[PDB]
Design a protein around this ligand. Structure first.
Ligand code: ZN
Length: 186
């Protein structure tokens, strides 16, 4: 099903903490592409143009640079199924079975809120990140359209402080025209 009005508001960063619920890795099952290559090829330009156009205080090149810093990554594709996450970075691959570790509610400098879903990897000697946090503008069980994933090896607390880089993944089958469409229209 499409989004209830509570889901829409939550996707815009407005929600009541009492409504936040745990979620399972299954909400992210599937094969995912980084959108980074489409920022680079310049196929995301129409998105940043539209955003600039709707706000006279913003510029194209500054919106794009904000998404550049945010999207940049070499993990081009991610696969999730059966409690396992698999990462393809260039020619390297790694995978780990991930355990759920809760969620965390955040309030941003803008006063908008978000929720991260935390996961930890079962091996201390895997190439896969030990800590992974999922943020998708969803605050309760629902299958994800696209996601931002925070990946690190140090601590969950450290990743929670990351605000500038957030590699971003859309379903692998999607074309550039279709990624842009989703970005323009909710
Ligand atoms: Zn998003």
């Amino acid at each position: 099903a499409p989004m209830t009005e509570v889901e829409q508001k939550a996707a815009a960063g407005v929600f009541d903490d009492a409504n936040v619920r745990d979620r399972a890795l299954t909400d992210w099952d599937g094969m995912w592409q980084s959108v980074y290559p489409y920022l680079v090829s310049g196929e995301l330009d129409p998105v940043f143009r539209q955003k600039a156009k709707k706000d006279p205080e913003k510029t194209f090149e500054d919106i794009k640079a904000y998404y550049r810093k945010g999207y940049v990554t070499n993990v081009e594709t991610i696969g999730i199924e059966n409690g396992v996450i698999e990462f393809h970075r260039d020619n390297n691959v790694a995978s780990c079975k991930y355990n759920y570790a809760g969620y965390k509610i955040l309030t941003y400098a803008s006063g908008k809120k978000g929720v991260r879903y935390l996961f930890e990897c079962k091996d201390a000697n895997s190439k896969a990140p030990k800590y992974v946090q999922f943020s998708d503008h969803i605050i309760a069980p629902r299958k994800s359209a696209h996601f931002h994933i925070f990946m690190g090896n140090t601590s969950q607390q450290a990743l929670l402080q990351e605000m500038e880089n957030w590699p971003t993944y859309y379903p692998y089958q999607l074309k550039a025209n279709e990624v842009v469409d989703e970005m323009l229209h909710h």
